[PDB]
Amino acid sequence: PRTVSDTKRAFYAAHTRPIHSIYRRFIEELLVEIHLLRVNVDFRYSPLFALGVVTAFDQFMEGYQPEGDRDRIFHALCVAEEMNPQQLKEDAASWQQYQGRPLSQILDELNSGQPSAPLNSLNHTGKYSRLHAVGLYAFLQELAGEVTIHLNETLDQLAPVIPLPIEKVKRDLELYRSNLDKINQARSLMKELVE
């Protein structure tokens, strides 16, 4: 008496090619992007980079089932890149320190000549990546004053303080927000559907 599982396995033996997934696309694109950046001689690891990778990953993976496989995938992503996943998570989590602080105290601390870690990593990023912008974005969201609303006006205030290319960052962060909106719409439609 042939079982459901026998039928599924017969299918997969007859079609061995991987099944298309938007999640597979996100993971592979992020693997490629971290790889290409990281072979570059001007790439320097920083806690800002760690925050960007972790935010990018957490935000495109929030609908993924089963939820246990998120950290398994994240772990596998980091070993694939020859990176320490625990180190990224700690560095990302070290920005929690700045939760609820006002923008004025951040800007002042950056002009002081002795900003704390990981805030100081805005001067030591190395070669620029859109992941640095995602990290910056995540950091700003956790400040007080809901500083992300008129984001382009906020980024102008950081421009004379930090050496990130603010025109690139503005451009990259309008793409990321636009894309995340559309992924959220799509995911709620499939969340509605699966009922």
Side-chain angles (χ1 to χ4, degrees), residues 1-190 192-195:
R2 283 185 101 236
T3 71
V4 164
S5 292
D6 297 327
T7 296
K8 286 194 199 181
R9 293 182 208 118
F11 169 83
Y12 286 116
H15 179 84
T16 52
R17 304 182 183 202
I19 307 301
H20 172 50
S21 172
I22 193 59
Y23 293 97
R24 186 191 303 287
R25 177 169 279 271
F26 293 147
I27 296 151
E28 290 185 11
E29 284 176 2
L30 186 63
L31 280 160
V32 172
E33 180 183 25
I34 294 166
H35 179 85
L36 288 177
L37 177 64
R38 198 162 154 286
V39 297
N40 196 296
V41 176
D42 289 8
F43 160 85
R44 286 171 99 157
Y45 175 81
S46 73
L48 185 64
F49 176 78
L51 183 61
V53 169
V54 172
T55 310
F57 184 88
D58 281 9
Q59 269 176 320
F60 71 64
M61 298 292 288
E62 71 178 67
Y64 189 96
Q65 291 292 282
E67 71 182 311
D69 286 9
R70 285 178 218 163
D71 300 335
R72 292 179 186 106
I73 289 161
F74 185 75
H75 199 287
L77 191 141
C78 290
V79 304
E81 302 290 351
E82 290 162 20
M83 279 177 158
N84 193 324
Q86 194 193 324
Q87 192 195 37
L88 270 72
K89 287 186 289 200
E90 288 191 66
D91 287 345
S94 74
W95 296 84
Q96 291 173 23
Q97 180 185 348
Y98 310 117
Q99 277 186 16
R101 299 259 229 87
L103 182 59
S104 57
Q105 279 182 46
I106 295 309
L107 295 167
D108 191 34
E109 182 164 324
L110 287 161
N111 293 340
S112 69
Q114 61 177 113
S116 65
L119 179 56
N120 69 336
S121 72
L122 297 173
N123 304 309
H124 303 280
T125 61
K127 180 174 166 62
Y128 174 78
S129 166
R130 68 104 200 172
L131 291 162
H132 292 121
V134 171
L136 183 60
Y137 181 62
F139 165 60
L140 294 166
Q141 284 179 301
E142 300 306 321
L143 300 186
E146 288 165 290
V147 188
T148 57
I149 291 165
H150 305 274
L151 179 54
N152 297 323
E153 189 269 318
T154 296
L155 290 169
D156 292 335
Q157 299 195 243
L158 285 148
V161 181
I162 68 172
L164 270 60
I166 283 294
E167 295 303 299
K168 281 197 177 193
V169 168
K170 279 182 180 198
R171 182 206 66 190
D172 289 351
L173 286 184
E174 290 180 39
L175 184 54
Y176 185 80
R177 294 164 96 185
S178 172
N179 288 8
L180 193 58
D181 282 312
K182 293 195 295 214
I183 297 154
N184 287 345
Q185 283 193 246
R187 267 199 287 97
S188 44
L189 287 156
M190 302 314 315
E192 278 179 296
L193 183 137
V194 180
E195 291 213 65

mmCIF file of all heavy atoms in Angstrom, residues 115-135:
data_model
loop_
_atom_site.group_PDB
_atom_site.id
_atom_site.type_symbol
_atom_site.label_atom_id
_atom_site.label_comp_id
_atom_site.label_asym_id
_atom_site.label_seq_id
_atom_site.Cartn_x
_atom_site.Cartn_y
_atom_site.Cartn_z
ATOM 1 N N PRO A 115 34.403 58.460 20.407
ATOM 2 C CA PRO A 115 33.154 57.723 20.459
ATOM 3 C C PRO A 115 33.328 56.275 20.919
ATOM 4 O O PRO A 115 34.306 55.615 20.560
ATOM 5 C CB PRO A 115 32.669 57.745 18.999
ATOM 6 C CG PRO A 115 33.904 57.954 18.192
ATOM 7 C CD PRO A 115 34.738 58.862 19.026
ATOM 8 N N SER A 116 32.365 55.794 21.694
ATOM 9 C CA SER A 116 32.334 54.408 22.137
ATOM 10 C C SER A 116 32.162 53.434 20.970
ATOM 11 O O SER A 116 31.770 53.815 19.862
ATOM 12 C CB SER A 116 31.185 54.198 23.127
ATOM 13 O OG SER A 116 29.928 54.394 22.488
ATOM 14 N N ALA A 117 32.468 52.173 21.252
ATOM 15 C CA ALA A 117 32.211 51.075 20.341
ATOM 16 C C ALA A 117 30.789 50.522 20.648
ATOM 17 O O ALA A 117 30.394 50.477 21.828
ATOM 18 C CB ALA A 117 33.281 49.991 20.510
ATOM 19 N N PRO A 118 30.020 50.105 19.635
ATOM 20 C CA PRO A 118 30.414 50.066 18.226
ATOM 21 C C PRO A 118 30.137 51.343 17.408
ATOM 22 O O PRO A 118 30.319 51.316 16.191
ATOM 23 C CB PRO A 118 29.548 48.934 17.687
ATOM 24 C CG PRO A 118 28.272 49.116 18.446
ATOM 25 C CD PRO A 118 28.729 49.431 19.848
ATOM 26 N N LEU A 119 29.716 52.442 18.036
ATOM 27 C CA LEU A 119 29.428 53.665 17.285
ATOM 28 C C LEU A 119 30.633 54.155 16.477
ATOM 29 O O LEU A 119 30.476 54.589 15.337
ATOM 30 C CB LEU A 119 28.920 54.776 18.205
ATOM 31 C CG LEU A 119 28.593 56.114 17.555
ATOM 32 C CD1 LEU A 119 27.572 55.940 16.446
ATOM 33 C CD2 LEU A 119 28.090 57.088 18.610
ATOM 34 N N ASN A 120 31.828 54.055 17.062
ATOM 35 C CA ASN A 120 33.087 54.434 16.386
ATOM 36 C C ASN A 120 33.319 53.762 15.021
ATOM 37 O O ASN A 120 34.045 54.302 14.181
ATOM 38 C CB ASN A 120 34.298 54.148 17.294
ATOM 39 C CG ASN A 120 34.552 52.657 17.492
ATOM 40 O OD1 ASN A 120 33.641 51.824 17.362
ATOM 41 N ND2 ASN A 120 35.795 52.311 17.801
ATOM 42 N N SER A 121 32.717 52.590 14.806
ATOM 43 C CA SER A 121 32.833 51.867 13.523
ATOM 44 C C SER A 121 32.272 52.599 12.287
ATOM 45 O O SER A 121 32.518 52.159 11.165
ATOM 46 C CB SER A 121 32.179 50.489 13.619
ATOM 47 O OG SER A 121 30.762 50.612 13.655
ATOM 48 N N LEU A 122 31.533 53.694 12.474
ATOM 49 C CA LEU A 122 31.143 54.547 11.343
ATOM 50 C C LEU A 122 32.334 55.251 10.656
ATOM 51 O O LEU A 122 32.224 55.627 9.491
ATOM 52 C CB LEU A 122 30.087 55.567 11.771
ATOM 53 C CG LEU A 122 28.744 55.001 12.251
ATOM 54 C CD1 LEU A 122 27.852 56.103 12.800
ATOM 55 C CD2 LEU A 122 28.024 54.273 11.130
ATOM 56 N N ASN A 123 33.460 55.413 11.357
ATOM 57 C CA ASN A 123 34.706 55.924 10.752
ATOM 58 C C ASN A 123 35.621 54.826 10.186
ATOM 59 O O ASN A 123 36.507 55.138 9.389
ATOM 60 C CB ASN A 123 35.513 56.745 11.771
ATOM 61 C CG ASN A 123 34.717 57.887 12.367
ATOM 62 O OD1 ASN A 123 34.115 58.674 11.644
ATOM 63 N ND2 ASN A 123 34.709 57.980 13.691
ATOM 64 N N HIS A 124 35.425 53.567 10.592
ATOM 65 C CA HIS A 124 36.321 52.458 10.217
ATOM 66 C C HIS A 124 35.636 51.366 9.374
ATOM 67 O O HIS A 124 35.932 50.178 9.543
ATOM 68 C CB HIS A 124 36.918 51.830 11.485
ATOM 69 C CG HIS A 124 37.656 52.800 12.352
ATOM 70 N ND1 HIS A 124 38.947 53.206 12.083
ATOM 71 C CD2 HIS A 124 37.288 53.444 13.485
ATOM 72 C CE1 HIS A 124 39.340 54.059 13.013
ATOM 73 N NE2 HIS A 124 38.352 54.223 13.874
ATOM 74 N N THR A 125 34.751 51.757 8.452
ATOM 75 C CA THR A 125 34.008 50.782 7.628
ATOM 76 C C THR A 125 34.813 50.142 6.486
ATOM 77 O O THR A 125 34.538 48.993 6.126
ATOM 78 C CB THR A 125 32.735 51.388 7.007
ATOM 79 O OG1 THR A 125 33.082 52.479 6.152
ATOM 80 C CG2 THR A 125 31.799 51.871 8.081
ATOM 81 N N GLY A 126 35.782 50.871 5.922
ATOM 82 C CA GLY A 126 36.517 50.422 4.728
ATOM 83 C C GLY A 126 35.702 50.632 3.458
ATOM 84 O O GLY A 126 34.925 51.589 3.372
ATOM 85 N N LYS A 127 35.869 49.744 2.475
ATOM 86 C CA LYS A 127 35.085 49.802 1.236
ATOM 87 C C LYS A 127 33.582 49.774 1.531
ATOM 88 O O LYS A 127 33.116 48.980 2.348
ATOM 89 C CB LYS A 127 35.435 48.645 0.295
ATOM 90 C CG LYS A 127 34.645 48.649 -1.013
ATOM 91 C CD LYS A 127 35.114 47.576 -1.984
ATOM 92 C CE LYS A 127 34.108 47.372 -3.110
ATOM 93 N NZ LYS A 127 33.928 48.607 -3.924
ATOM 94 N N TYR A 128 32.840 50.626 0.835
ATOM 95 C CA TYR A 128 31.423 50.784 1.076
ATOM 96 C C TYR A 128 30.607 49.659 0.430
ATOM 97 O O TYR A 128 30.932 49.181 -0.655
ATOM 98 C CB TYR A 128 30.928 52.151 0.583
ATOM 99 C CG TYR A 128 29.430 52.305 0.682
ATOM 100 C CD1 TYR A 128 28.809 52.573 1.907
ATOM 101 C CD2 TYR A 128 28.623 52.134 -0.444
ATOM 102 C CE1 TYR A 128 27.425 52.690 1.996
ATOM 103 C CE2 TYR A 128 27.251 52.252 -0.362
ATOM 104 C CZ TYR A 128 26.653 52.524 0.854
ATOM 105 O OH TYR A 128 25.282 52.636 0.898
ATOM 106 N N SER A 129 29.541 49.273 1.125
ATOM 107 C CA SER A 129 28.598 48.253 0.693
ATOM 108 C C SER A 129 27.225 48.742 1.092
ATOM 109 O O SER A 129 27.090 49.469 2.078
ATOM 110 C CB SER A 129 28.884 46.931 1.403
ATOM 111 O OG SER A 129 27.806 46.023 1.255
ATOM 112 N N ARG A 130 26.199 48.325 0.360
ATOM 113 C CA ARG A 130 24.833 48.654 0.763
ATOM 114 C C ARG A 130 24.447 48.033 2.120
ATOM 115 O O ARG A 130 23.536 48.521 2.773
ATOM 116 C CB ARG A 130 23.811 48.358 -0.354
ATOM 117 C CG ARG A 130 23.591 46.894 -0.686
ATOM 118 C CD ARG A 130 22.284 46.371 -0.117
ATOM 119 N NE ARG A 130 22.291 44.916 -0.023
ATOM 120 C CZ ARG A 130 21.346 44.184 0.569
ATOM 121 N NH1 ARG A 130 20.267 44.754 1.109
ATOM 122 N NH2 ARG A 130 21.472 42.861 0.609
ATOM 123 N N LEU A 131 25.170 47.002 2.563
ATOM 124 C CA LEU A 131 24.979 46.441 3.914
ATOM 125 C C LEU A 131 25.367 47.412 5.035
ATOM 126 O O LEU A 131 24.777 47.381 6.111
ATOM 127 C CB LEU A 131 25.742 45.121 4.080
ATOM 128 C CG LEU A 131 25.184 43.959 3.266
ATOM 129 C CD1 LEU A 131 26.218 42.843 3.129
ATOM 130 C CD2 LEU A 131 23.897 43.424 3.875
ATOM 131 N N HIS A 132 26.356 48.261 4.791
ATOM 132 C CA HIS A 132 26.670 49.332 5.739
ATOM 133 C C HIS A 132 25.486 50.289 5.917
ATOM 134 O O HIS A 132 25.197 50.711 7.027
ATOM 135 C CB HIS A 132 27.917 50.092 5.302
ATOM 136 C CG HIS A 132 29.168 49.277 5.390
ATOM 137 N ND1 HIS A 132 29.968 49.017 4.301
ATOM 138 C CD2 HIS A 132 29.734 48.631 6.436
ATOM 139 C CE1 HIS A 132 30.988 48.267 4.678
ATOM 140 N NE2 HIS A 132 30.868 48.017 5.969
ATOM 141 N N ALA A 133 24.789 50.596 4.829
ATOM 142 C CA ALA A 133 23.595 51.439 4.885
ATOM 143 C C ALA A 133 22.448 50.779 5.643
ATOM 144 O O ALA A 133 21.763 51.446 6.417
ATOM 145 C CB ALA A 133 23.145 51.819 3.481
ATOM 146 N N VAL A 134 22.241 49.478 5.425
ATOM 147 C CA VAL A 134 21.210 48.727 6.155
ATOM 148 C C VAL A 134 21.500 48.735 7.667
ATOM 149 O O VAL A 134 20.583 48.885 8.479
ATOM 150 C CB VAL A 134 21.062 47.282 5.625
ATOM 151 C CG1 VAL A 134 20.152 46.448 6.525
ATOM 152 C CG2 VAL A 134 20.518 47.286 4.199
ATOM 153 N N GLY A 135 22.771 48.583 8.026
ATOM 154 C CA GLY A 135 23.205 48.662 9.413
ATOM 155 C C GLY A 135 22.937 50.034 9.996
ATOM 156 O O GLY A 135 22.391 50.155 11.092
#
